[PDB]
Design a protein around this motif. Structure first.
Motif, PDB file in Angstrom:
ATOM      1  N   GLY A  47     -12.012   2.947   7.571  1.00 32.23           N
ATOM      2  CA  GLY A  47     -11.331   3.884   8.464  1.00 32.23           C
ATOM      3  C   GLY A  47     -11.707   5.349   8.288  1.00 32.23           C
ATOM      4  N   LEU A  48     -12.117   5.770   7.086  1.00 29.59           N
ATOM      5  CA  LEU A  48     -12.529   7.174   6.859  1.00 29.59           C
ATOM      6  C   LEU A  48     -13.749   7.632   7.683  1.00 29.59           C
ATOM      7  CD1 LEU A  48     -11.954   7.924   3.068  1.00 29.59           C
ATOM      8  CD2 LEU A  48     -10.825   9.097   5.012  1.00 29.59           C
ATOM      9  N   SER A  49     -13.805   8.921   8.002  1.00 31.90           N
ATOM     10  CA  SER A  49     -14.920   9.507   8.757  1.00 31.90           C
ATOM     11  C   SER A  49     -14.966  11.026   8.558  1.00 31.90           C
ATOM     12  CB  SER A  49     -14.776   9.173  10.251  1.00 31.90           C
ATOM     13  OG  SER A  49     -13.711   9.904  10.825  1.00 31.90           O
ATOM     14  N   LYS A  50     -15.852  11.712   9.280  1.00 30.56           N
ATOM     15  CA  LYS A  50     -15.790  13.180   9.350  1.00 30.56           C
ATOM     16  C   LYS A  50     -14.532  13.733  10.075  1.00 30.56           C
ATOM     17  CE  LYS A  50     -19.789  13.090  11.647  1.00 30.56           C
ATOM     18  NZ  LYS A  50     -21.081  13.482  12.291  1.00 30.56           N
ATOM     19  N   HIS A  51     -13.790  12.853  10.755  1.00 31.81           N
ATOM     20  CA  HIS A  51     -12.654  13.229  11.614  1.00 31.81           C
ATOM     21  C   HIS A  51     -11.256  13.045  10.999  1.00 31.81           C
ATOM     22  CE1 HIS A  51     -15.962  13.552  14.287  1.00 31.81           C
ATOM     23  NE2 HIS A  51     -16.219  12.256  14.211  1.00 31.81           N
ATOM     24  N   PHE A  52     -11.209  12.806   9.687  1.00 36.89           N
ATOM     25  CA  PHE A  52      -9.964  12.781   8.920  1.00 36.89           C
ATOM     26  C   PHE A  52      -9.560  14.220   8.632  1.00 36.89           C
ATOM     27  CE2 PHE A  52      -7.156  11.315   5.371  1.00 36.89           C
ATOM     28  CZ  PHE A  52      -6.572  10.234   6.020  1.00 36.89           C
ATOM     29  N   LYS A  64       0.793  -1.265   0.000  1.00 36.96           N
ATOM     30  CA  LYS A  64       0.000   0.000   0.000  1.00 36.96           C
ATOM     31  C   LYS A  64       0.824   1.314   0.000  1.00 36.96           C
ATOM     32  CE  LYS A  64      -4.143  -1.861   2.198  1.00 36.96           C
ATOM     33  NZ  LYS A  64      -5.052  -1.747   1.027  1.00 36.96           N
ATOM     34  N   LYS A  65       2.154   1.166   0.028  1.00 34.06           N
ATOM     35  CA  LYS A  65       3.086   2.294   0.035  1.00 34.06           C
ATOM     36  C   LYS A  65       3.731   2.496  -1.328  1.00 34.06           C
ATOM     37  CE  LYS A  65       3.928   1.473   4.863  1.00 34.06           C
ATOM     38  NZ  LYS A  65       4.890   1.384   5.979  1.00 34.06           N
ATOM     39  N   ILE A  66       3.783   3.747  -1.797  1.00 30.96           N
ATOM     40  CA  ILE A  66       4.420   4.072  -3.031  1.00 30.96           C
ATOM     41  C   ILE A  66       5.803   4.575  -2.594  1.00 30.96           C
ATOM     42  CG2 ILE A  66       4.346   5.489  -5.120  1.00 30.96           C
ATOM     43  CD1 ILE A  66       2.008   3.492  -4.780  1.00 30.96           C
ATOM     44  N   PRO A  67       6.905   3.934  -3.082  1.00 28.74           N
ATOM     45  CA  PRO A  67       8.292   4.368  -2.751  1.00 28.74           C
ATOM     46  C   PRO A  67       8.662   5.712  -3.353  1.00 28.74           C
ATOM     47  CG  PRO A  67       8.312   2.563  -4.339  1.00 28.74           C
ATOM     48  CD  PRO A  67       6.918   2.616  -3.747  1.00 28.74           C
ATOM     49  N   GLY A  68       9.455   6.503  -2.622  1.00 30.93           N
ATOM     50  CA  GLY A  68       9.994   7.759  -3.140  1.00 30.93           C
ATOM     51  C   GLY A  68       8.970   8.864  -3.123  1.00 30.93           C
ATOM     52  N   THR A  69       7.917   8.638  -2.342  1.00 29.00           N
ATOM     53  CA  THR A  69       6.852   9.590  -2.172  1.00 29.00           C
ATOM     54  C   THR A  69       6.460   9.498  -0.715  1.00 29.00           C
ATOM     55  OG1 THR A  69       5.152   7.913  -2.688  1.00 29.00           O
ATOM     56  CG2 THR A  69       5.962   9.285  -4.553  1.00 29.00           C
ATOM     57  N   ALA A  98      -5.111   3.018   2.229  1.00 31.21           N
ATOM     58  CA  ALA A  98      -4.569   2.574   3.519  1.00 31.21           C
ATOM     59  C   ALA A  98      -5.111   3.487   4.609  1.00 31.21           C
ATOM     60  CB  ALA A  98      -3.044   2.613   3.477  1.00 31.21           C
ATOM     61  N   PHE A  99      -6.412   3.391   4.826  1.00 33.77           N
ATOM     62  CA  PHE A  99      -7.108   4.333   5.725  1.00 33.77           C
ATOM     63  C   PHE A  99      -7.401   3.819   7.145  1.00 33.77           C
ATOM     64  CE2 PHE A  99      -7.796   6.214   1.564  1.00 33.77           C
ATOM     65  CZ  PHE A  99      -7.647   7.569   1.793  1.00 33.77           C
ATOM     66  N   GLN A 100      -6.957   2.601   7.447  1.00 32.23           N
ATOM     67  CA  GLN A 100      -7.328   1.873   8.674  1.00 32.23           C
ATOM     68  C   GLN A 100      -6.104   1.426   9.492  1.00 32.23           C
ATOM     69  OE1 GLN A 100      -7.646  -2.257   8.237  1.00 32.23           O
ATOM     70  NE2 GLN A 100      -8.129  -2.178   6.060  1.00 32.23           N
ATOM     71  N   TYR A 101      -5.076   2.280   9.564  1.00 29.03           N
ATOM     72  CA  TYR A 101      -3.863   2.004  10.353  1.00 29.03           C
ATOM     73  C   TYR A 101      -3.428   3.240  11.160  1.00 29.03           C
ATOM     74  CZ  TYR A 101      -3.780  -1.358   6.506  1.00 29.03           C
ATOM     75  OH  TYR A 101      -4.106  -2.322   5.590  1.00 29.03           O
ATOM     76  N   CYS A 119       3.406   9.679   5.742  1.00 28.33           N
ATOM     77  CA  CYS A 119       2.446   9.793   4.674  1.00 28.33           C
ATOM     78  C   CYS A 119       1.945  11.223   4.641  1.00 28.33           C
ATOM     79  CB  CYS A 119       1.288   8.819   4.885  1.00 28.33           C
ATOM     80  SG  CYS A 119       0.147   8.791   3.482  1.00 28.33           S
ATOM     81  N   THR A 120       2.270  11.949   3.574  1.00 26.96           N
ATOM     82  CA  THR A 120       1.764  13.299   3.342  1.00 26.96           C
ATOM     83  C   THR A 120       0.392  13.333   2.681  1.00 26.96           C
ATOM     84  OG1 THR A 120       3.207  13.340   1.376  1.00 26.96           O
ATOM     85  CG2 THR A 120       3.943  14.551   3.320  1.00 26.96           C
ATOM     86  N   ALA A 121      -0.011  12.235   2.024  1.00 25.38           N
ATOM     87  CA  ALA A 121      -1.230  12.246   1.206  1.00 25.38           C
ATOM     88  C   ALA A 121      -1.799  10.846   0.978  1.00 25.38           C
ATOM     89  CB  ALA A 121      -0.959  12.913  -0.132  1.00 25.38           C
ATOM     90  N   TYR A 122      -3.106  10.721   1.157  1.00 25.50           N
ATOM     91  CA  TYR A 122      -3.807   9.457   1.012  1.00 25.50           C
ATOM     92  C   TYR A 122      -4.645   9.402  -0.264  1.00 25.50           C
ATOM     93  CZ  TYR A 122      -2.534   8.831   5.945  1.00 25.50           C
ATOM     94  OH  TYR A 122      -1.857   8.673   7.136  1.00 25.50           O
ATOM     95  N   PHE A 123      -4.262   8.511  -1.170  1.00 23.79           N
ATOM     96  CA  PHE A 123      -5.066   8.278  -2.385  1.00 23.79           C
ATOM     97  C   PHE A 123      -6.190   7.266  -2.055  1.00 23.79           C
ATOM     98  CE2 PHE A 123      -3.165  10.804  -5.741  1.00 23.79           C
ATOM     99  CZ  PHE A 123      -1.990  11.222  -5.126  1.00 23.79           C
ATOM    100  N   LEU A 124      -7.392   7.498  -2.600  1.00 27.17           N
ATOM    101  CA  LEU A 124      -8.496   6.528  -2.467  1.00 27.17           C
ATOM    102  C   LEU A 124      -9.001   6.129  -3.835  1.00 27.17           C
ATOM    103  CD1 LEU A 124     -10.637   4.872  -0.946  1.00 27.17           C
ATOM    104  CD2 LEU A 124     -12.155   6.899  -1.146  1.00 27.17           C
ATOM    105  N   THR A 125      -8.845   4.840  -4.210  1.00 30.74           N
ATOM    106  CA  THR A 125      -9.021   4.394  -5.633  1.00 30.74           C
ATOM    107  C   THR A 125     -10.506   4.373  -6.046  1.00 30.74           C
ATOM    108  OG1 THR A 125      -8.981   2.005  -5.014  1.00 30.74           O
ATOM    109  CG2 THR A 125      -6.906   2.970  -5.704  1.00 30.74           C
ATOM    110  N   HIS A 126     -11.346   4.005  -5.109  1.00 26.77           N
ATOM    111  CA  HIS A 126     -12.771   3.963  -5.350  1.00 26.77           C
ATOM    112  C   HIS A 126     -13.509   3.801  -4.017  1.00 26.77           C
ATOM    113  CE1 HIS A 126     -11.495  -0.245  -4.987  1.00 26.77           C
ATOM    114  NE2 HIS A 126     -12.738  -0.669  -4.916  1.00 26.77           N
TER     115      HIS A 126
END
Ligand code: NI
Length: 341
Positions: free
Chosen positions: A41-46, A6-11, A17-20, A26-33
């Motif tokens: 793991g996502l909520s109003k509190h992210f 779930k990790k992209i190297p060099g970034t 990966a929203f449930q850890y 991690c500066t930025a979380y991509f969500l594919t669908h």
């Protein structure tokens, strides 16, 4: 703890990966669908930036109640910069708003993360046709040769004709279709269209569909069940007891239900074509299982990887056991050795 795949190297970038908790660096979380195994793991509190498609943006905002400021929607097929990294998002031919992510690393590496996809030849003439891809992070859900299934267009045919016949033989029959996430909307929208009905559904499912930027959608759906003769029910409820239960509730407006359970692969794919399917029948109710997939079959995945010619494949599905992992590796080697990359 977040897995290596779930990790992209060099970034500072992670994918689905929203449930850890907070992921260290991690500066930025991509969500594919928007599917629960991916958004878990996502909520109003992210309060980290999420990058996603417009449509997945709508789902975040309106169904999970994420605050506008943390949703960064990106257009598709468009060169975009994200913390000084060129990215591009492409249609994944999965559910509404589902994307693959191309990463152009500063070091010159190019990574494709497929999210969840159903590979298609139309992908071989997208932005991918232009340049080499060193690393493929692959949806391996059906990476084994037993997994054949028909084209989506074959299945929609079968469904259209089954429903239309039944409704024309008995116009007091009701069609139901099962559901539990987004995806497969064409099943119910195709049947409704042939029958000249809007599709009736609950309030919560109407809201889900109203986020999806389907054209002309106000003409295609409604929350008024009485007015409509294609109903959507919870998939859990698609069974004799729950259908009867529901058949009571319409109040003597229908005498017969014809239902559809769109399924993933089921063992009977091995022994029976689409043209030869049968339902389970306990009286006036009848239930069809139909294998409508939004994941690549074995051969569709194989064609796509062989065209891509990636230097390294990292699987994202079926990684949990060593037997699965080992079986999958063997397929990758064969494919490469066959195709001479
Ligand atoms: Ni999915």
């Amino acid at each position: 703890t977040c897995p290596f795949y779930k990790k992209i190297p060099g970034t500072g970038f992670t994918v689905d990966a929203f449930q850890y908790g907070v992921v260290e660096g991690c500066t930025a979380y991509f969500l594919t669908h928007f599917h629960s195994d991916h958004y878990a793991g996502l909520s109003k509190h992210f309060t980290f930036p999420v990058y996603c498609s417009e449509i997945t943006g709508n789902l975040l905002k309106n169904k999970l109640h994420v605050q506008e400021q943390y949703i960064h929607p990106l257009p598709l097929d468009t060169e975009c910069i994200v913390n000084g990294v060129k990215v591009v998002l492409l249609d994944a031919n999965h559910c509404p708003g589902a994307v693959m992510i191309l990463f152009y690393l500063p070091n010159g590496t190019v990574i494709l993360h497929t999210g969840d996809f159903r590979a298609d030849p139309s992908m071989e003439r997208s932005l991918l046709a232009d340049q080499k891809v060193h690393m493929l992070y692959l949806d391996t859900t059906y990476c084994s040769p037993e997994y054949t299934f028909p084209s989506q267009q074959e299945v929609i045919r079968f469904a259209i004709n089954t429903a239309f016949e039944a409704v024309t033989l008995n116009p007091h029959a009701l069609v139901v279709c099962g559901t539990y996430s987004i995806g497969k909307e064409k099943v119910f929208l195709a049947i409704a269209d042939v029958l000249g009905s809007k599709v009736g559904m609950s309030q919560e499912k109407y809201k889900t569909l109203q986020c999806l930027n389907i054209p002309e959608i106000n003409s295609l759906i409604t929350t008024d069940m009485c007015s409509s003769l294609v109903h959507l029910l919870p998939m859990m409820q698609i069974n004799f007891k729950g259908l009867q239960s529901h058949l009571k509730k319409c109040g003597g407006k229908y005498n017969q239900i014809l239902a559809f359970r769109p399924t993933g692969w089921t063992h009977s794919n091995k022994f029976t074509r689409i043209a030869d399917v049968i339902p389970q029948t306990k009286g006036n109710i009848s239930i069809y299982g139909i294998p409508y997939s939004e994941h690549s079959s074995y051969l569709e995945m194989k064609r796509f990887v062989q065209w891509l010619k990636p230097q390294k494949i990292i699987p994202t599905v079926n990684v949990g056991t060593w037997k699965s992992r080992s079986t999958m590796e063997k397929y990758f080697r064969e494919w490469k050795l066959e195709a001479g990359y």
